[PDB]
Amino acid sequence: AIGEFMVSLPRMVYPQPKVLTPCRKDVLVVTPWLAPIVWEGTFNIDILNEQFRLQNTTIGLTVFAIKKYVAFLKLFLETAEKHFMVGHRVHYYVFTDQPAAVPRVTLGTGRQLSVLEVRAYKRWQDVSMRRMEMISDFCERRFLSEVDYLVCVDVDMEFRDHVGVEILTPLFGTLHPGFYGSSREAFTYERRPQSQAYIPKDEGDFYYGGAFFGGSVQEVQRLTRACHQAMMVDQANGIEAVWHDESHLNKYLLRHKPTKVLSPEYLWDQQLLGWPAVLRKLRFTAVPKNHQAVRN
Amino acid sequence: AIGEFMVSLPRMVYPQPKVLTPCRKDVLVVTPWLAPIVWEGTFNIDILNEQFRLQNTTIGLTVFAIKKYVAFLKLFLETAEKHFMVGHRVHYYVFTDQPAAVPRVTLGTGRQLSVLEVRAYKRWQDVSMRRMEMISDFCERRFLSEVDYLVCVDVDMEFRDHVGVEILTPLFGTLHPGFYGSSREAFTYERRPQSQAYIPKDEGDFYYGGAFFGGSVQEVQRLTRACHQAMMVDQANGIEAVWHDESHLNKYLLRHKPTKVLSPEYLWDQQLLGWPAVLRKLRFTAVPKNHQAVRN
Ligand SMILES: O=c1ccn([C@@H]2O[C@H](COP(=O)(O)OP(=O)(O)O[C@H]3O[C@H](CO)[C@H](O)[C@H](O)[C@H]3O)[C@@H](O)[C@H]2O)c(=O)[nH]1
Ligand SMILES: O=c1ccn([C@@H]2O[C@H](COP(=O)(O)OP(=O)(O)O[C@H]3O[C@H](CO)[C@H](O)[C@H](O)[C@H]3O)[C@@H](O)[C@H]2O)c(=O)[nH]1
Ligand SMILES: [Mn+2]
Ligand SMILES: [Mn+2]
């Protein structure tokens, strides 16, 4: 459930928070609109697990595996079993044009998987963009009655470390690993005023990654419907945003600030970026792929 | 309103958040359960004001002025007019045994004051403790229909600097200025197991002050009803907590973690504690009083 009567926490023994010691001295841990930025060292997972288990929380995880991307599912789901919301109720929603090709992955107790058959668009850009419409369409079909939160991710990924209830909040985005240290003018927002995703050079908080966003079902429905409607306006005007759904996600989260922001621990590419000191954990990472080959 | 459809923020020009620069290097700015700890330098008030004005937010402020404490009202209310939620809708609720003695303070537009007549208990301890019952009783009489958030404060105080929408959240407490740097064993929690307010030596996050707490009307109703019911159990068992309502507030907020914590900028005593470097602003401060004299 979300927003229901909360019972009391049990007695717990844990280290006292240190008011006069910053939890991180190297990174920003709260946005200017008072949303936590989630890094290792900012949270006590024992306290959070108690809070969310007492609310009987169910987390949905959406993933699209269309055309050749079915190949990514086995590692994605295996590693999600090891690292994603372990101990909590989970419902995986695998959207695919090939149900027969979803691997039989053994799930832990309290975890379930549904296969949702959808059409396959020809262009990879359209496959990626139409996720917003598809997630929105399923936010009445299933999600509102089945889960409390939705987490929406790319499939060409693997979990390597804990991803848990510390992410859960009404609306979150994730810092894209290529831009967390960049100035806003260097962010690859859409810069053409003719697109609904347009963001001027002097605006922007962060560059959020298309590959990991989420929130309550209500907030995810809002986000995905808004991004889809914006993409349909652009299509009618003969323009396609520079980074497709990611461009529209960024416009939405500029104008509707997230209530948590995930650090790049939650969206990383070790091949391209290594393992910087500022990353104490690499939680959810890109898997190698010949992009051109696998998209066609 | 709270929790209603939020429109989009307008374009705004402000400094980019710095992911690789902490906003404070000297203090903890987020609790281990991911609640912001509100210090100067953690928030951009322009962004927050937009968010809360677009939701048409109304803030109630409760204050008790019973017996001789009517003397504190003029400065309290004058200074609240200069510093408290300016630009937002405010409803002051002055609880008193002497309506005739409430000063005629000129209010800004969009701000109103109601006088609520209540009984005066003999012992100052009872006056202080019975605020929980009284706030709870008024959470159906008025607050649910009149305000979005409630802020509940001591009257023997003055505002010296901004106290605004950065505090607003479902449930908040405030770090007591005498204990923010103290170890939990030094916190003056109730330590007798016979009291409902009992907290063992190895438990506790913070020592919250009785003089400044709040949240949504729903959460404040929960807190104040729980503290009152706990105080009635103690009374039936012939025990009175060491710091009265503050002891019960601390037990409640240990077991029901606040969604923001206010720094001691929001609850200070300059006579007793000076102006430490760690306090960039002194927002809400004790006024001098001969405690014994004014309480009897
Ligand atoms: O044939 C395809 C193409 C794409 N996808 C789905 O679409 C997602 C995004 O496509 P890629 O992973 O191929 O592309 P990138 O990793 O470059 O994607 C990044 O840029 C995209 C926009 O160009 C999106 O915003 C995406 O979320 C972001 O991680 C995939 O993970 C997969 O879930 C398929 O299922 N099949
Ligand atoms: O004759 C009285 C006595 C008290 N009060 C009200 O009760 C509040 C609390 O009493 P004091 O301010 O006299 O006491 P302290 O500042 O020592 O209070 C601190 O300790 C108290 C418990 O002992 C409460 O928790 C309180 O919120 C906390 O700031 C006052 O501000 C006032 O609002 C009156 O109105 N009249
Ligand atoms: Mn990808
Ligand atoms: Mn006081």
Q: Is the dihedral of CA A233, A239, A245, A247 positive or negative?
A: negative
Is B93 known to sit in a ligand binding site? no
Q: How many CB atoms lie within 10 A of CB A109?
A: 6
For an interface test with B, the pick among A13, A16, A20, A218 (most B C-beta atoms closer than 10 Å) comes out as A16
CB distance from B257 to chain A under 8 Å?
Answer: yes
How close, in Å, is residue A54 to chain B by CA atoms? Answer: 12
For an interface test with A, the pick among B14, B18, B19, B203 (most A C-beta atoms closer than 10 Å) comes out as B19
Name every residue whose Cβ is closer than 8 Å to that of residue A272 and which is 6 or more positions away in sequence.
Answer: A177, A178, A286
- Pocket residue to mutate for ligand 2, from B128, B208, B212, B272, most atoms within 8 A of Cβ: B128
Contact residues on chain B for A27, CB-CB shorter than 8 A = 19-20, 22
Spatial CA neighbour of B176 closest among B204, B201, B139, B150? B204
Examine the residue annotation and report whether B265 is marked as an active-site residue of this protein.
no
Spatial CA neighbour of A30 closest among A206, A158, A218, A246? A206
Contact residues on chain B for A205, CB-CB shorter than 8 A = 16-17
Q: How far is the CA of B154 from the centre of ligand 2 (A)?
A: 6
The token pair at A244 is 């497709």
> What whole-number distance in Å separates Cα of residue B179 and Cα of residue B177?
6
CA distances from B140 to A95, A177, B57, B64, B66 (A): 47, 49, 19, 18, 22
The token pair at B222 is 């929960």
Angle between helix A244-255 and helix A124-138 axes, rounded to 10 deg: 50
Using a CB cutoff of 5 Å, list residues around ligand 3, an ion: A 154, 156
CB distance from B121 to chain A under 8 Å?
Answer: no
Spatial CA neighbour of B91 closest among B121, B68, B115, B72? B115
How close, in Å, is residue B38 to chain A by CA atoms? Answer: 8
Contact residues on chain B for A25, CB-CB shorter than 8 A = 22, 25
For an interface test with B, the pick among A4, A19, A263 (most B C-beta atoms closer than 10 Å) comes out as A19
Q: At CB < 8 A and 24+ separation, what contacts does A197-200 make?
A: A197/A230, A197/A234, A197/A241, A197/A242, A197/A247, A197/A248, A197/A250, A197/A251, A198/A251, A199/A250, A199/A251, A199/A254, A200/B11
Q: How far is the CA of B213 from the centre of ligand 2 (A)?
A: 13
Q: How far is the CA of B156 from the centre of ligand 2 (A)?
A: 8
Q: How far is the CA of A225 from the centre of ligand 3 (A)?
A: 21
For residue B63, the ligand closest to its alpha carbon is 2
> Which residues of A are catalytic, by number?
246
For residue A295, the ligand closest to its alpha carbon is 1
User: Quick one: residue A85, left, alpha or beta (phi over 0 = left, psi -120 to 50 = alpha)?
Assistant: left
CB distance from B29 to chain A under 8 Å?
Answer: yes
Which atom of ligand 1 is the closest one to the Cα of A247?
25
DSSP string, A41-67: TS--HHHHHHHHHHTT-EEEEEEEE-G
Ligand 2: list residues with CB < 6 Å. Answer: B 64-67, 69, 124, 127-128, 154-156, 209-211, 243-246, 295
Answer CATH for A1-296 from 3.40.640.10, 1.10.3720.10, 3.90.550.10, 3.40.190.10: 3.90.550.10
CA distances from A138 to A144, A200, B177 (A): 9, 33, 50
CB-CB contact of A157 with A72 (8 Å): yes
The token pair at A210 is 């298309």
The shortest CB-CB distance from B180 to any of A19, A166, A255 is to A19
> What whole-number distance in Å separates Cα of residue B68 and Cα of residue A64?
68
Residues 77 to 116 of B: which have CB under 8 A from any A CB? Answer: none
- Entry resolution (Å): 1.2
Which atom of ligand 1 is the closest one to the Cα of A286?
16
DSSP-derived pairing of the beta strands A157-159 and A149-153 = unpaired
- Locus of tokens 């994605």: A76
CB contact under 8 A, A257 and B29: no
